[PDB]
Amino acid sequence: DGVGSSSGNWHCDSQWLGDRVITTSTRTWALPTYNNHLYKQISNSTSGGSSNDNAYFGYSTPWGYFDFNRFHCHFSPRDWQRLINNNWGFRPKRLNFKLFNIQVKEVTDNNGVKTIANNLTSTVQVFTDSDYQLPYVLGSAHEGCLPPFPADVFMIPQYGYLTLNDGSQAVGRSSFYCLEYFPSQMLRTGNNFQFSYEFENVPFHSSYAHSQSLDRLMNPLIDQYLYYLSKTINGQQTLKFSVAGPSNMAVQGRNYIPGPSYRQQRVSTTVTQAAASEFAWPGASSWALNGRNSLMNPGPAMASHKEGEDRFFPLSGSLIFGKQGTGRDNVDADKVMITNEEEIKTTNPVATESYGQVATNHQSAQAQAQTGWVQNQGILPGMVWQDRDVYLQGPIWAKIPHTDGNFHPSPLMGGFGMKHPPPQILIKNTPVPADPPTAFNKDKLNSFITQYSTGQVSVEIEWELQKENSKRWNPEIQYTSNYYKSNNVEFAVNTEGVYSEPRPIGTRYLTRNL
Amino acid sequence: AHSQSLDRLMNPLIDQYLYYLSKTINGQQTLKFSVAGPSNMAVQGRNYIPGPSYRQQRVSTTVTQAAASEFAWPGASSWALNGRNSLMNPGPAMASHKE
Amino acid sequence: LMGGFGMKHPPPQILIKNTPVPADPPTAFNKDKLNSFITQYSTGQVSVEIEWELQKENSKRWNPEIQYTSNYYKSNNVEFAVNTEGVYSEPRPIGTRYLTRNL
């Protein structure tokens, strides 16, 4: 429109209908100039790294991008509490995104002092990768998302991507992408940008915990009409059979079995434990691709620990969040928040235990029957399992890789897997050259006016709800704040205005039968 | 042919908001955690993992290699059906060799 | 208890704030919330119009009523006016109960 007219209003609210909840969040963003308007080839050689498992090749772009792939970007703690305490499931339906109130500033430095002024004629470029023609980086748990607290002003992360690499070198199959080779809208201070997106059909997330275990689905009062091998010896091959009943539930015939497993090493959170060695990488569970070892993290959805063993967690089978103010490198256990998936112990195997035992020979009068531990078990017919729970500060969705085949493409870090997820939204400040020389020079200009941009961003997502119809008589487990006095209110600001999330919040508090 | 690898789908410029177990000992169970970022891509959390496998024995096409035994059948990867051994051929789709 | 009209739904609170305008951010991404802002303030005009309903007096009282009135006697300043330095002052509290009616 014009310089003196706002191009949008501040929309931040949650609307709770019967089977739907609509979340709207608005944030103020700041966008600097990245790479000084240049594309730069990057690799482990340019970052000084030399281990082959950490080798890479790719490019850093002068473009930024908008990321809102975390639940706390849309749900307040109270809204999250309502969702998890009142619904058996939820899933995103549609998306509305807006950019408005664009403000481009120029920075001039004379001597140790910088002056900031408006550049009303400068432009900012925005486009969406609706055709998914660029590498998708929103499927990784990267920082730079919209802040959970609406009052926080955030910096737009720089967009970068990786391609095929051989050590620090590239190959002929490696691809280079120029983001200026895409049509993009150019916005001055009076312009705004908006688009709508429809989520593809995805299953409802399981925001419930099973009230029954897979091995306890039988009637505890009635025998089965099936027999099991009880005895074998007299005290001669004396085969004896008995009815499987309530007194021996472990040997009863069952129609379904627990889901797959990929065993994790076990770590205790108890201080004054002596470790026998440094094992964080040597003892790690891991998968190899083209000679590169990657850590299995978080791996298949498995129960974090057995009943009563909350002190143990899988070495890399659980999401680890950092508390507010936590450092980047080598922080203590009390500075991080270790999530656990104990709710899925009713259907999924324990992460730090073998799946089971399998016969490994033919027993005879000369050879005793032998069994072997199954540390990793693939998918078998009749298996049932629960996917990893999602969290308030955890990811929402991920892009299913474009491959010939996949099985249960639920993101392993939690969330909804989609072939066509919300498109990447890329933003960049248009370069503004400084005064050029009065004589023609064919070289590309390298002198630009120092600029940055700021504005507001709004994203609205409609969520579909799956209401609970339980006939359970006794009250359910519910997420609740603790009344006991404390120096600060949980999920609030401190005396210095710092917002903090004191604990990870799952979704599985209500119960339903298996 | 894919222009990206499954273990290199992250942004090479931005850290993850997830932590991994870095250290354990002092040099006492001293648990230490660090942010998974571009400097250590191998330990970053990932949503998808490579497909299944059924390991094959490795053969070199280079002449003047000495083999330790006749292994074309004894070293073979194989599946059994009703007491009959059949060669795993060509088996699951797997990369023929490393880079 | 301090005087006035009690309402379950009084005039709503009107809240106003200057939108923060960040200063120049660093050229390398940092996940922390921005703490460098351009120093700003805002000014403008505000208008409020209120319609009041009146209850007229229908007294049959014969003698004149008590009325609030200014005092004619000379003074250095006019009551409810500005001083020589332009300072406006309210010299006394003024109630509302001067007219009379039967009990």
XYZ file of C-alpha atoms in Angstrom:
716
model
C 0.000 0.000 0.000
C 1.936 2.983 1.327
C 4.740 3.974 3.667
C 2.413 5.274 6.380
C -0.134 2.429 6.382
C 0.241 -0.892 8.177
C 0.038 -3.940 5.909
C -1.292 -6.270 8.606
C -2.456 -6.634 12.185
C -1.146 -8.653 15.120
C -3.066 -11.946 15.246
C -2.165 -14.299 18.096
C -4.933 -16.397 19.650
C -6.330 -19.922 19.875
C -9.934 -20.765 18.986
C -11.389 -24.009 20.346
C -14.366 -25.384 18.430
C -15.935 -28.813 18.924
C -13.691 -31.060 16.827
C -11.221 -28.371 15.714
C -8.753 -25.934 17.262
C -7.314 -23.011 15.286
C -3.965 -21.638 16.463
C -2.655 -18.255 15.326
C 0.770 -16.890 16.243
C 2.500 -13.640 15.281
C 6.180 -12.857 15.821
C 8.583 -10.025 15.042
C 11.611 -11.065 12.988
C 14.940 -9.565 11.947
C 16.756 -10.488 8.731
C 20.409 -9.503 8.175
C 22.526 -9.839 5.052
C 23.964 -13.357 4.820
C 27.303 -14.170 3.145
C 27.421 -10.551 1.905
C 24.919 -11.444 -0.860
C 27.116 -14.320 -2.093
C 26.799 -18.057 -2.577
C 29.699 -19.942 -1.012
C 30.821 -23.533 -1.422
C 31.236 -25.146 2.002
C 32.709 -28.448 3.145
C 34.414 -30.087 6.100
C 37.686 -28.737 4.679
C 36.367 -25.119 4.942
C 35.294 -25.864 8.584
C 38.658 -27.688 9.304
C 37.163 -31.192 10.078
C 38.944 -34.409 8.901
C 36.975 -37.468 10.225
C 35.253 -39.286 7.317
C 31.945 -39.818 9.240
C 31.745 -35.979 9.531
C 32.812 -35.177 5.906
C 30.428 -33.031 3.746
C 30.092 -30.803 0.637
C 27.389 -28.158 0.000
C 26.585 -24.462 -0.303
C 25.626 -21.573 1.962
C 23.102 -19.162 0.466
C 22.436 -15.467 1.163
C 18.781 -16.409 1.745
C 17.032 -16.850 5.060
C 14.023 -19.032 5.738
C 11.008 -19.123 8.047
C 10.610 -22.194 10.255
C 7.618 -22.969 12.478
C 8.090 -26.747 12.749
C 7.861 -26.857 16.553
C 4.637 -27.252 18.513
C 5.349 -24.398 20.933
C 5.401 -22.019 17.949
C 1.608 -22.458 17.788
C 0.373 -23.848 21.133
C 0.637 -21.979 24.406
C 1.299 -24.176 27.465
C -2.356 -23.852 28.516
C -3.582 -24.745 25.019
C -1.181 -27.698 24.979
C -2.501 -28.816 28.372
C -6.094 -28.635 27.115
C -5.190 -30.566 23.954
C -3.366 -33.344 25.791
C -5.878 -33.661 28.650
C -9.042 -33.598 26.514
C -8.235 -35.361 23.221
C -7.225 -38.846 22.097
C -5.586 -37.503 18.933
C -4.929 -34.525 16.700
C -3.479 -33.677 13.293
C -2.886 -30.522 11.232
C -5.416 -29.723 8.512
C -4.576 -26.429 6.762
C -2.147 -23.531 6.984
C -2.253 -19.760 6.516
C 0.975 -17.741 6.397
C 1.483 -13.974 6.246
C 4.392 -11.538 6.010
C 3.612 -7.869 6.600
C 4.885 -4.577 8.028
C 8.156 -4.882 6.125
C 10.801 -2.444 7.382
C 14.184 -2.234 5.636
C 16.957 -0.347 7.432
C 20.346 0.928 6.279
C 23.361 1.035 8.604
C 26.167 3.576 8.188
C 29.357 3.596 10.269
C 31.437 6.780 10.448
C 33.953 6.089 13.235
C 33.045 3.566 15.933
C 29.417 4.733 15.776
C 26.635 3.283 13.617
C 23.566 5.196 12.414
C 20.398 3.346 11.376
C 17.867 4.905 9.003
C 14.981 3.714 6.861
C 15.500 2.858 3.185
C 11.933 3.190 1.918
C 12.800 2.187 -1.669
C 14.604 -1.074 -0.859
C 12.931 -4.447 -1.362
C 12.805 -7.864 0.298
C 12.271 -11.010 -1.779
C 10.111 -13.924 -0.607
C 9.032 -17.125 -2.344
C 7.770 -20.575 -1.371
C 9.193 -23.867 -2.659
C 5.723 -25.186 -3.449
C 7.133 -27.643 -6.013
C 9.747 -28.971 -3.534
C 12.573 -28.328 -5.999
C 15.105 -27.361 -3.295
C 16.692 -29.490 -0.552
C 14.355 -29.697 2.438
C 16.036 -28.622 5.689
C 12.870 -28.247 7.786
C 12.867 -32.005 8.456
C 15.783 -31.666 10.880
C 15.441 -30.382 14.440
C 17.274 -27.131 13.684
C 17.191 -23.972 15.759
C 15.790 -20.729 14.389
C 12.071 -21.467 14.685
C 9.498 -18.956 15.875
C 9.968 -18.365 19.620
C 7.506 -20.016 22.017
C 7.000 -16.661 23.761
C 5.108 -14.215 21.494
C 7.027 -11.177 22.793
C 10.453 -12.535 21.803
C 12.024 -11.116 18.635
C 13.932 -13.750 16.672
C 16.617 -13.800 13.992
C 15.849 -15.538 10.696
C 18.201 -18.519 10.210
C 20.402 -18.691 7.133
C 19.465 -21.256 4.490
C 22.031 -23.878 3.546
C 21.986 -27.301 1.952
C 24.211 -30.321 1.389
C 24.780 -32.473 -1.687
C 26.731 -35.625 -2.555
C 30.290 -35.619 -1.225
C 33.453 -37.718 -1.401
C 35.465 -36.539 1.573
C 35.646 -32.765 1.208
C 35.249 -33.014 -2.587
C 32.157 -33.137 -4.785
C 31.195 -35.545 -7.561
C 29.588 -35.076 -10.955
C 26.196 -36.047 -9.528
C 26.354 -33.205 -6.979
C 23.792 -30.454 -7.570
C 24.155 -26.686 -7.188
C 20.984 -24.648 -6.657
C 20.632 -20.908 -7.261
C 17.648 -19.509 -5.371
C 17.545 -16.474 -7.683
C 16.538 -18.936 -10.432
C 13.069 -19.008 -8.809
C 10.250 -16.470 -9.251
C 9.941 -14.449 -6.052
C 7.781 -11.551 -4.921
C 9.636 -8.318 -4.164
C 8.167 -6.328 -1.272
C 8.780 -2.732 -0.273
C 7.652 -1.312 3.068
C 4.060 -1.067 1.819
C 3.713 -4.616 0.480
C 2.754 -7.882 2.175
C 3.012 -11.586 1.359
C 0.634 -14.450 2.098
C -0.192 -17.970 0.952
C -2.344 -20.907 2.024
C -1.361 -24.562 2.373
C -3.443 -27.715 2.820
C -1.944 -30.576 4.813
C -2.126 -33.949 3.116
C -4.084 -36.650 4.916
C -2.107 -38.023 7.868
C -3.123 -40.323 10.748
C -4.032 -38.797 14.086
C -1.136 -38.654 16.526
C -1.562 -41.031 19.463
C -2.043 -38.673 22.414
C -3.043 -41.581 24.663
C -1.318 -44.247 26.743
C -2.576 -47.817 26.561
C -4.319 -49.070 29.698
C -3.545 -52.684 28.726
C -0.340 -54.525 27.864
C 0.040 -56.688 24.775
C 0.782 -59.767 26.912
C -2.297 -59.273 29.146
C -5.190 -59.160 26.667
C -6.724 -62.503 27.678
C -9.586 -63.228 30.052
C -7.970 -63.827 33.479
C -10.762 -66.255 34.458
C -11.015 -68.709 31.528
C -8.564 -71.305 30.236
C -7.551 -71.463 26.596
C -8.532 -74.419 24.426
C -4.862 -74.723 23.390
C -2.077 -76.803 24.928
C 1.612 -76.062 25.469
C 4.613 -78.315 26.039
C 5.102 -78.344 29.812
C 7.483 -81.175 30.697
C 9.951 -83.245 28.675
C 11.951 -85.473 31.023
C 10.834 -87.852 33.774
C 13.241 -86.474 36.368
C 13.527 -90.723 28.393
C 11.691 -88.157 26.268
C 8.497 -87.881 28.318
C 6.494 -85.220 26.478
C 3.837 -83.642 28.695
C 1.252 -81.038 27.705
C -0.914 -78.735 29.806
C -3.707 -76.226 29.292
C -2.555 -72.613 29.073
C -4.627 -70.680 31.591
C -4.637 -67.781 34.055
C -2.019 -69.438 36.281
C 0.521 -69.415 33.400
C -0.158 -66.394 31.193
C 3.361 -66.297 29.730
C 2.793 -69.473 27.678
C -0.677 -68.636 26.342
C -1.115 -68.370 22.596
C -1.285 -64.798 21.334
C -2.308 -63.293 18.005
C -0.043 -60.218 18.036
C 3.524 -59.522 19.133
C 5.478 -56.393 20.114
C 6.982 -54.187 17.456
C 10.533 -54.037 16.125
C 13.635 -53.172 18.108
C 17.195 -51.919 17.649
C 18.942 -52.266 20.988
C 20.474 -49.171 22.678
C 23.249 -49.217 25.324
C 21.968 -48.256 28.829
C 23.125 -45.144 30.725
C 22.356 -44.292 34.366
C 21.566 -40.672 35.383
C 22.714 -41.462 38.997
C 25.865 -39.474 40.000
C 28.853 -41.381 41.615
C 28.418 -44.263 39.142
C 31.876 -45.355 37.887
C 32.001 -46.000 34.101
C 34.382 -48.809 32.975
C 35.515 -46.838 29.829
C 34.717 -43.866 27.574
C 31.818 -45.449 25.588
C 29.605 -42.588 24.220
C 30.771 -43.310 20.609
C 32.472 -46.811 20.919
C 29.361 -48.330 22.633
C 26.882 -46.478 20.360
C 24.228 -48.162 18.196
C 24.699 -47.017 14.631
C 23.957 -47.462 10.865
C 26.389 -47.200 7.958
C 25.796 -45.540 4.585
C 28.465 -45.501 1.851
C 31.193 -46.084 4.422
C 29.973 -43.341 6.780
C 28.863 -44.293 10.271
C 25.846 -42.292 11.569
C 24.568 -42.616 15.189
C 21.149 -44.395 15.535
C 19.290 -41.342 16.918
C 16.579 -41.500 18.087
C 16.007 -44.748 16.183
C 12.892 -46.923 16.313
C 10.222 -46.040 18.857
C 11.011 -48.194 21.894
C 10.254 -48.030 25.601
C 12.934 -45.958 27.317
C 13.143 -48.157 30.422
C 11.432 -50.967 32.286
C 8.980 -50.331 35.112
C 10.643 -48.600 38.052
C 13.900 -47.950 36.148
C 13.376 -44.257 35.347
C 17.081 -43.616 36.192
C 18.075 -45.380 32.942
C 17.794 -43.936 29.440
C 18.953 -45.233 26.045
C 22.346 -43.826 24.934
C 20.802 -42.226 21.805
C 17.150 -43.427 21.741
C 15.489 -40.402 23.342
C 15.100 -36.739 22.461
C 17.283 -34.484 24.623
C 16.213 -30.866 25.073
C 18.306 -28.139 26.658
C 17.084 -25.991 29.520
C 16.980 -22.218 29.169
C 20.487 -20.770 29.212
C 22.171 -24.157 28.727
C 25.518 -24.034 26.955
C 26.343 -25.625 23.630
C 29.192 -28.006 24.512
C 29.706 -30.486 27.363
C 26.946 -29.505 29.768
C 25.970 -31.503 32.837
C 22.919 -33.753 33.038
C 20.999 -31.211 35.139
C 21.309 -28.694 32.271
C 19.342 -30.885 29.821
C 15.880 -32.455 29.789
C 15.839 -36.155 28.876
C 12.530 -37.252 27.376
C 11.238 -40.778 27.947
C 8.766 -43.045 26.147
C 7.633 -45.222 29.060
C 4.008 -44.931 27.904
C 4.665 -47.265 24.946
C 6.047 -50.087 27.113
C 2.698 -51.869 26.658
C 3.351 -52.542 22.951
C 6.934 -51.608 22.229
C 10.029 -53.463 23.461
C 12.417 -51.847 25.916
C 15.139 -49.881 24.137
C 17.916 -51.238 26.388
C 16.787 -54.889 26.303
C 16.826 -57.681 23.747
C 13.633 -58.311 21.795
C 13.599 -61.935 22.938
C 15.218 -65.338 22.542
C 15.297 -67.611 19.494
C 16.358 -71.239 19.165
C 19.813 -71.681 17.638
C 20.193 -75.471 17.300
C 18.390 -78.820 17.263
C 18.158 -80.333 20.739
C 18.930 -84.035 21.109
C 20.094 -86.607 23.642
C 23.664 -85.365 23.071
C 23.112 -81.606 22.616
C 21.255 -79.373 25.061
C 18.780 -76.897 23.601
C 20.423 -73.544 22.879
C 18.932 -70.071 22.504
C 20.326 -66.738 21.389
C 19.446 -63.168 22.254
C 17.770 -61.072 19.555
C 19.372 -57.635 19.818
C 17.733 -56.332 16.620
C 14.410 -57.575 15.242
C 12.854 -56.466 11.973
C 9.189 -56.177 11.097
C 7.210 -59.413 11.377
C 3.558 -60.106 10.527
C 1.295 -59.578 13.516
C 3.509 -56.883 15.042
C 1.908 -53.811 16.605
C 3.661 -50.741 17.972
C 3.238 -47.105 18.967
C 5.154 -44.266 17.347
C 7.310 -41.832 19.299
C 5.353 -39.222 21.235
C 5.434 -35.563 20.236
C 6.277 -32.741 22.627
C 5.449 -29.071 23.089
C 9.013 -28.089 22.156
C 9.446 -30.971 19.697
C 9.080 -31.104 15.919
C 5.714 -31.184 14.165
C 6.295 -32.652 10.696
C 8.971 -33.908 8.315
C 9.293 -34.521 4.585
C 9.161 -38.169 3.542
C 12.228 -38.771 1.329
C 11.360 -39.274 -2.334
C 12.308 -42.947 -2.662
C 10.923 -46.040 -4.358
C 9.941 -47.659 -1.066
C 9.396 -46.866 2.591
C 7.718 -48.488 5.585
C 5.588 -46.574 8.118
C 7.058 -43.161 7.232
C 6.345 -41.591 10.605
C 9.327 -39.334 11.443
C 11.583 -41.090 13.940
C 12.010 -37.867 15.939
C 8.219 -37.654 16.255
C 5.495 -35.972 14.241
C 3.640 -36.350 10.941
C 5.358 -37.659 7.816
C 4.240 -36.124 4.535
C 5.310 -36.445 0.915
C 4.279 -32.785 0.460
C 4.859 -31.014 3.791
C 4.454 -27.251 4.264
C 6.751 -25.661 1.682
C 9.965 -23.906 2.596
C 9.546 -20.129 2.818
C 12.740 -18.362 1.754
C 13.446 -14.667 2.317
C 16.369 -12.423 1.378
C 17.199 -8.722 1.369
C 17.686 -7.462 -2.174
C 21.285 -6.200 -2.503
C 21.599 -2.431 -2.851
C 24.908 -1.503 -4.528
C 26.947 1.422 -3.255
C 28.156 4.144 -5.617
C 29.710 2.455 -8.678
C 32.793 3.853 -10.429
C 32.266 6.408 -13.177
C 34.165 4.147 -15.614
C 32.677 0.839 -16.722
C 34.052 -2.290 -15.054
C 32.796 -5.731 -16.053
C 33.381 -7.347 -12.647
C 30.376 -7.990 -10.434
C 29.808 -5.320 -7.806
C 31.192 -6.079 -4.342
C 30.381 -2.768 -2.596
C 26.864 -2.712 -1.145
C 24.949 -0.590 1.340
C 24.804 -2.325 4.718
C 21.157 -3.261 5.233
C 18.876 -5.413 7.351
C 15.117 -5.906 7.441
C 12.492 -6.446 10.119
C 8.786 -7.160 10.198
C 6.022 -9.372 11.521
C 5.193 -12.955 10.555
C 1.871 -14.699 11.181
C 1.039 -18.387 10.754
C -2.419 -19.889 11.315
C -2.922 -23.663 11.497
C -6.233 -25.499 11.840
C -6.002 -28.744 13.821
C -8.541 -31.571 13.796
C -9.340 -33.194 17.133
C -10.213 -36.789 18.019
C -12.375 -36.688 21.135
C -12.227 -39.396 23.790
C -15.212 -41.691 24.374
C -13.798 -43.806 27.203
C -16.010 -45.757 29.597
C -13.274 -45.791 32.257
C -14.734 -45.304 35.729
C -11.744 -44.066 37.738
C -10.236 -40.649 36.952
C -7.506 -40.393 34.331
C -3.975 -39.076 34.671
C -3.839 -35.402 33.704
C -1.026 -32.921 33.225
C -1.223 -30.330 35.995
C 0.863 -27.560 37.490
C 2.018 -27.924 41.090
C 0.377 -25.609 43.612
C 3.406 -25.611 45.928
C 5.066 -22.219 46.268
C 8.056 -21.404 44.075
C 10.164 -18.375 43.218
C 8.849 -18.352 39.634
C 5.743 -19.505 37.792
C 6.406 -22.420 35.451
C 6.240 -21.442 31.765
C 6.566 -17.740 32.567
C 9.197 -15.009 32.550
C 11.858 -14.500 35.212
C 12.726 -11.246 36.986
C 14.970 -10.457 33.990
C 12.223 -11.132 31.439
C 13.652 -14.480 30.303
C 11.022 -17.002 29.226
C 11.782 -20.633 30.038
C 10.201 -24.041 29.476
C 10.974 -26.008 32.667
C 10.107 -29.505 31.397
C 9.151 -31.354 28.208
C 5.424 -32.041 27.925
C 4.203 -35.099 26.056
C 0.704 -35.830 24.817
C -0.080 -39.249 26.324
C -2.033 -38.840 29.562
C -5.484 -40.160 28.651
C -5.926 -43.918 28.335
C -7.707 -46.358 26.043
C -7.843 -50.124 25.688
C -5.426 -52.042 23.478
C 19.994 -40.926 -8.898
C 19.628 -39.007 -5.651
C 21.720 -35.842 -5.410
C 21.601 -36.013 -1.594
C 22.514 -38.699 0.927
C 20.195 -39.794 3.718
C 22.745 -38.751 6.367
C 23.240 -35.251 4.877
C 19.710 -33.819 4.769
C 20.245 -31.209 7.500
C 21.093 -27.529 7.193
C 24.921 -27.327 7.344
C 24.750 -23.870 8.977
C 22.311 -24.273 11.902
C 22.576 -26.295 15.105
C 19.853 -28.682 16.195
C 17.801 -28.004 19.315
C 18.613 -31.557 20.477
C 21.472 -32.797 22.654
C 23.571 -35.961 22.486
C 25.695 -37.757 25.069
C 29.248 -36.572 24.398
C 31.424 -37.548 27.361
C 30.999 -40.029 30.213
C 34.224 -40.205 32.223
C 36.383 -37.463 33.739
C 39.634 -38.802 32.302
C 33.187 -41.364 38.100
C 30.198 -41.320 35.748
C 30.501 -37.743 34.487
C 27.677 -37.457 31.953
C 28.237 -34.605 29.501
C 25.899 -33.439 26.741
C 26.509 -31.246 23.703
C 24.503 -29.672 20.899
C 24.461 -31.681 17.676
C 25.520 -29.299 14.923
C 27.381 -28.978 11.620
C 30.725 -29.888 13.217
C 29.355 -33.326 14.248
C 26.780 -34.438 11.680
C 27.104 -38.143 12.519
C 25.369 -37.717 15.900
C 22.503 -35.481 14.754
C 18.972 -36.758 15.201
C 17.407 -38.051 11.998
C 13.844 -38.957 11.062
C 14.592 -41.692 8.501
C 17.130 -44.502 8.240
C 18.567 -46.575 5.374
C 16.687 -49.570 4.075
C 17.136 -53.260 4.840
C 20.223 -55.333 4.148
C 21.329 -58.939 3.673
C 25.113 -58.951 3.622
C 26.983 -60.349 0.567
C 30.599 -61.624 0.555
C 32.995 -59.265 -1.327
C 34.871 -60.252 -4.509
C 37.634 -58.252 -6.224
C 37.785 -58.050 -10.057
C 41.581 -57.313 -9.845
C 43.709 -60.129 -11.405
C 46.711 -61.557 -9.375
C 44.635 -61.500 -6.166
C 45.240 -64.762 -4.238
C 42.030 -66.316 -2.807
C 42.432 -68.153 0.553
C 39.975 -70.973 -0.485
C 37.308 -71.990 -3.015
C 34.387 -69.914 -1.597
C 31.861 -69.296 -4.457
C 29.293 -71.660 -2.803
C 30.719 -72.121 0.803
C 30.953 -68.304 1.352
C 27.613 -67.584 -0.398
C 24.659 -65.771 1.199
C 21.615 -67.985 0.925
C 18.002 -68.827 2.004
C 16.536 -72.243 2.791
C 13.116 -73.581 1.792
C 11.934 -77.071 2.799
C 15.519 -78.203 3.310
C 16.745 -76.834 -0.036
C 19.409 -74.146 -0.045
C 18.950 -71.479 -2.778
C 21.584 -68.747 -3.447
C 20.498 -65.179 -2.418
C 20.538 -63.748 -5.973
C 20.334 -60.855 -6.548
C 18.734 -60.344 -3.130
C 17.641 -57.031 -1.620
C 18.557 -53.853 -3.475
C 21.824 -52.704 -1.896
C 24.724 -50.511 -2.960
C 27.253 -52.637 -4.832
C 30.317 -50.942 -3.327
C 31.465 -47.952 -1.317
C 32.757 -44.781 -2.955
C -16.684 2.070 48.080
C -14.478 4.865 46.706
C -17.514 6.248 44.865
C -18.946 5.756 41.399
C -20.834 3.162 39.355
C -20.243 -0.563 39.809
C -20.464 -2.678 36.670
C -19.891 -6.331 35.845
C -18.761 -5.195 32.367
C -17.173 -1.747 32.753
C -15.425 0.089 29.902
C -12.738 -2.302 28.665
C -9.054 -1.743 29.270
C -7.323 -0.124 26.291
C -3.728 -1.332 26.012
C -1.088 0.260 23.785
C 2.547 -0.597 23.068
C 5.272 0.450 20.645
C 6.228 -2.429 18.372
C 9.913 -3.261 18.992
C 12.230 -2.356 16.122
C 15.436 -4.436 16.269
C 18.794 -2.832 15.577
C 21.204 -4.339 13.053
C 21.452 -8.094 13.745
C 24.724 -10.017 13.393
C 25.576 -11.460 9.995
C 25.824 -14.945 11.561
C 22.721 -16.683 12.881
C 22.219 -16.638 16.650
C 19.242 -18.386 18.230
C 18.979 -16.042 21.228
C 16.204 -13.464 21.245
C 17.301 -10.026 20.090
C 18.179 -7.550 22.845
C 19.388 -4.617 20.700
C 16.540 -2.343 19.605
C 16.205 1.141 18.159
C 15.267 3.615 20.887
C 11.728 4.741 20.075
C 8.726 6.516 21.546
C 5.321 7.443 20.159
C 2.940 10.372 20.482
C -0.544 11.198 19.283
C -4.014 12.369 20.221
C -6.711 10.486 22.127
C -10.417 11.343 22.136
C -13.153 9.909 24.357
C -16.843 10.828 24.088
C -19.326 9.823 26.798
C -23.085 10.391 26.758
C -24.594 10.986 30.204
C -28.268 10.673 31.127
C -29.693 13.325 33.438
C -32.359 13.114 36.143
C -33.985 16.534 36.392
C -35.241 17.943 39.685
C -38.970 18.480 40.255
C -38.838 19.909 43.779
C -41.661 21.983 45.250
C -39.289 23.622 47.750
C -40.102 27.305 48.198
C -36.845 28.729 49.566
C -33.742 28.797 47.345
C -31.426 25.793 47.313
C -27.741 25.599 48.153
C -25.650 25.964 44.999
C -21.958 25.631 44.251
C -20.591 29.069 43.395
C -17.268 30.807 42.940
C -16.360 33.603 45.344
C -16.359 37.113 43.898
C -13.739 38.375 46.364
C -10.477 39.405 44.727
C -7.621 36.907 44.582
C -4.232 36.615 42.912
C -5.460 33.758 40.698
C -8.761 32.544 39.281
C -9.900 29.253 40.794
C -9.649 26.325 38.359
C -7.313 28.237 36.049
C -3.617 28.455 35.224
C -1.010 30.304 37.276
C 1.572 32.789 35.991
C 3.759 29.762 35.157
C 0.993 27.979 33.238
C 0.303 25.415 35.975
C -3.321 24.286 36.163
C -4.646 23.555 39.645
C -7.859 22.299 41.235
C -8.166 24.276 44.498
C -10.860 22.160 46.188
C -12.801 18.914 45.742
C -16.301 19.430 44.355
C -19.074 17.022 45.280
C -22.446 16.603 43.618
C -24.917 16.986 46.503
C -26.195 20.565 46.670
C -29.837 20.223 45.623
C -32.281 18.759 48.133
C -35.199 16.338 48.134
C -37.394 14.753 50.779
C -36.517 11.451 52.431
